[PDB]
Amino acid sequence: MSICTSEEWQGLMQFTLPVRLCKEIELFHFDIGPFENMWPGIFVYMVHRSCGTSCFELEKLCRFIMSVKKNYRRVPYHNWKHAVTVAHCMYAILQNNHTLFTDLERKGLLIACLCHDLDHRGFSNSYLQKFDHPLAALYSTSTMEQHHFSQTVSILQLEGHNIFSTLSSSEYEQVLEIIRKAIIATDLALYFGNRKQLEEMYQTGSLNLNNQSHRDRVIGLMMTACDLCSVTKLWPVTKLTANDIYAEFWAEGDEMKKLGIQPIPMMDRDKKDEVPQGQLGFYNAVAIPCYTTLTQILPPTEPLLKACRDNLSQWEKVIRGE
Ligand SMILES: COc1ccc2nc(C)c3c(C)nc(-c4cnccc4C)n3c2n1
Ligand SMILES: [Cl-]
Ligand SMILES: [Mg+2]
Ligand SMILES: [Zn+2]
């Protein structure tokens, strides 16, 4: 594990958020893009507004965040920027649904989101499961996500980083398990079953938020919605982020090329022409149904669906020549 320097977390401690951003941060469509130096402070802020200023010990929180940053890799997409973007979308969903979730869940989900892709290498579970490589060995299924949670706990175990130590022993294991499950949920492999179960649960009426199994499934879809939130930003942002996503995909093709394997079109840089069609298929089968089910369960999340609906309309334009 890599540790933050003294000036990094103390600098974050002294950081105050600009007043104009406070109003904008509340919105679903908010793009963190133009404020890089303010990303850790944006997270501090969201935690304080959601959970409280004294919830976490500030010194520990600031040490936690800056260290979390240093354990995100310098990769095109699954990087520190992605983590904050996912975290912010969670804050937005929470704020519009505040009382549905306990303080422990809100604390848990925000930290989980920031951590959910820790030490990502830009490679998929498929790549690691086919090659091996001592990560598919350690984690047979779902896989990078188990690594991300493992990484999260490893950071919490660094000197003065454990933001959760002041919780009761019961709450401490509660929050860790909330986080474990939330991070595991970001394995898109598990998303498809989860959304179908929830679709069934909502449609029949059987869905009950007091039901802990149902509750875990709701949080799971929330993690998926947040992980996908770049499909819900303004088209120029959405479009540019896709470039970072495929840059990773194509590199996973390149390494498969370097070791005598022929990758899928999605990961073949010699197949860029297929990208807009793959994006349409991704929205139609993944993003659209995700935000549709989430709006049915958490109605205040509708803006996320509409921004996705507009971004689909943009991808159809690319396809048709416009
Ligand atoms: C797993 O193939 C794909 C294929 C197309 C994708 N298009 C988008 C926009 C996207 C966003 C935001 N996020 C992810 C994602 C989700 N789960 C794991 C990895 C990624 C990059 N995708 C995509 N993923
Ligand atoms: Cl690491
Ligand atoms: Mg991930
Ligand atoms: Zn992610």
Closest-CA residue to 293 (of 222, 238, 187, 189): 222
Q: Is the dihedral of CA 59, 37, 97, 217 positive or negative?
A: negative
Distance, in Å, from the CA atom of 5 to the CA atom of 14, rounded to the nearest integer, reads 15
Closest-CA residue to 40 (of 6, 75, 16, 57): 16
DSSP for 216-272, written as a single string: HHHHHHHHHHHHTGGGGS-HHHHHHHHHHHHHHHHHHHHHHHHTT----GGG-GGGG
User: Domain containing 44: what range?
Assistant: 1-322
Closest-CA residue to 28 (of 293, 234, 201): 234
How is residue 283 annotated by DSSP?
I
Q: Residue 253, by phi and psi: left (phi above 0), alpha (psi -120 to 50) or beta?
A: alpha
Q: Is 227 one of the annotated binding-site residues? A: yes
Distance, in Å, from the CA atom of 135 to the CA atom of 119, rounded to the nearest integer, reads 12
Residue 59: burial class (beta carbons within 10 Å; 0-12, 13-18, 19+): middle
Closest-CA residue to 224 (of 297, 315, 317): 297
Q: Which residue has the tokens 């404020």?
A: 35
Which ligand is the nearest neighbour of the Cα of 243? 1
Q: What are phi and psi of 236, to 5 degrees?
A: -55, -35
Atom of ligand 1 nearest to the CA of 229: 12
CB contact at 8 A, 144 and 135:
yes
Q: Which residue has a Cα nearest atom 8 of ligand 1? A: 242
CB contact at 8 A, 116 and 90:
no
Identify residue 186 by its one-letter amino acid code.
T
Helical H segments across 78-211, by residue range: 80-95, 103-115, 125-131, 144-156, 169-185, 188-204
Distance, in Å, from the CA atom of 94 to the CA atom of 90, rounded to the nearest integer, reads 6
The domain tally of the chain equals 1
Determine the distance separating the centroid of ligand 1 and the alpha carbon of 245, expressed in angstroms.
7
In degrees to the nearest 10, what's the CA dihedral of 181, 185, 191, 196? 30
For 270-297, letters b (16+ CB in 10 Å) and e give: eeeeebbebbeebbeebbbbbbbbbbbb
CATH number where 84 lies: 1.10.1300.10
Q: Is the dihedral of CA 182, 95, 162, 175 positive or negative?
A: negative
Determine the distance separating the centroid of ligand 3 and the alpha carbon of 148, expressed in angstroms.
8
Distance, in Å, from the CA atom of 82 to the CA atom of 114, rounded to the nearest integer, reads 8
Distance, in Å, from the CA atom of 92 to the CA atom of 103, rounded to the nearest integer, reads 15
Q: Could you give the 3-state DSSP secondary structure of residue 26?
A: coil
Experimental resolution (Å): 1.9
Told to judge if 88 belongs to the known catalytic residues of this protein, a careful annotator would answer no
Closest-CA residue to 175 (of 152, 198, 145): 152
Determine the distance separating the centroid of ligand 2 and the alpha carbon of 254, expressed in angstroms.
24
Residue 96: burial class (beta carbons within 10 Å; 0-12, 13-18, 19+): middle
CB contact at 8 A, 191 and 290:
yes
Nearest 5 degrees, angle CA 224-CA 238-CA 304?
A: 45
Q: Which residue has the tokens 């089968």?
A: 285
Q: Which residue has the tokens 């401690």?
A: 13
